[PDB]
Amino acid sequence: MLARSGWLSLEALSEYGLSLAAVRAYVEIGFVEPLEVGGAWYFREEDLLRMAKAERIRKDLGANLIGAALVVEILER
């Protein structure tokens, strides 16, 4: 009698093709805010879609902060 909505753990990242080191780099710069208490990080489904968009714009260039062009992009819509 527990609803399965919650958040997404560090397990689905491999299914989404997102390395843990990249998630660390995104977290320490503020691209997305996880839920630490009480164990590992946790994210919403569309929270994992933002660096999923971000890690597809890395396929040409450049460094880690492409989320800057993404925060504007979601603000562009």
Binding site: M1, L2, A3, R4, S5, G6, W7, L8, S9, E11, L35, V37, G38, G39, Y42
Partner: protein, 232 residues
């Protein structure tokens, strides 16, 4: 490289008899894994947790070795209370199930030992029977995620209704559809009806989320019906 790799995918049952596997098969030991889980109703002070062994999505088709209850959960609106149902498989292979709570910290740990380990005959039996039934198991999956989508429409007509009192006609629509849900959960409807009801309730909440009052144009005082049919 070590032996005793997990021969079962273990999780927790959810609404509609749907697994939420917290540790899949061919995973090593020891392993401490868990996630965030939520409640169903308002002020829900207790949660039932039923661990399951197997891979078929139906909880009914599964075998359950643990069915316990968790009281002491602080009364909070559904979705906000997050329950850490954490599975720990130690070096011996005991399934320490700890029901941690992020808010206060109530717990109810259960130990299920390795005496439930099934032999290669039964491992092949369950694997080849799930694979044998897979063609209808995907049909049951399309049934089950659609039933949980119906439950999601119910809980969106439940969360928002207590968060916003919309149109009384829209409220009557929501209540009639909720009665349809009550008559179609232990008397489940066919999938075409399920989709035509879930999308109907999606449109019902789309018109229920209208925002302001009845903006029938520029908001006139009153109207009248026109005698469209020929007269005189």
């Amino acid at each position: 490289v070590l032996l005793d790799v997990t021969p079962l995918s273990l999780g927790v049952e959810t609404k509609g008899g749907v697994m939420t596997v917290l540790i899949p098969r061919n995973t090593t030991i020891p392993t401490r894994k868990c996630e965030i889980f939520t409640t169903a109703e308002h002020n829900q002070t207790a949660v039932e947790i039923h661990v399951l062994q197997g891979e078929r999505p139906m909880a009914q088709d599964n075998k359950s070795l643990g069915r316990f209850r968790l009281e002491g959960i602080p009364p909070m609106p559904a979705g906000v209370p997050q329950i850490e149902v954490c599975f720990d498989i130690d070096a011996n292979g005991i399934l320490h199930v700890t029901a941690k709570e992020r808010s206060t910290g109530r717990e109810a740990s259960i130990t299920i030992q390795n005496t439930t380990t099934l032999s290669e005959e039964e491992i092949q039996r369950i694997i080849e029977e799930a694979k044998r039934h897979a063609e209808e198991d995907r049909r049951r999956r399309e049934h089950a995620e659609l039933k949980n989508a119906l439950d999601s429409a119910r809980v969106q007509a439940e969360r928002v209704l207590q968060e916003r009192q919309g149109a009384p006609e829209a409220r009557a629509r929501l209540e009639a559809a909720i009665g349809k849900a009550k008559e179609l959960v232990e008397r489940d409807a066919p999938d075409p009806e399920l989709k035509a009801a879930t999308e109907e309730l999606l449109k019902a909440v789309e018109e229920y989320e209208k925002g302001a009052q009845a903006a029938s144009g520029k908001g006139p005082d009153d109207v009248i019906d026109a005698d469209y049919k020929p007269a005189d």
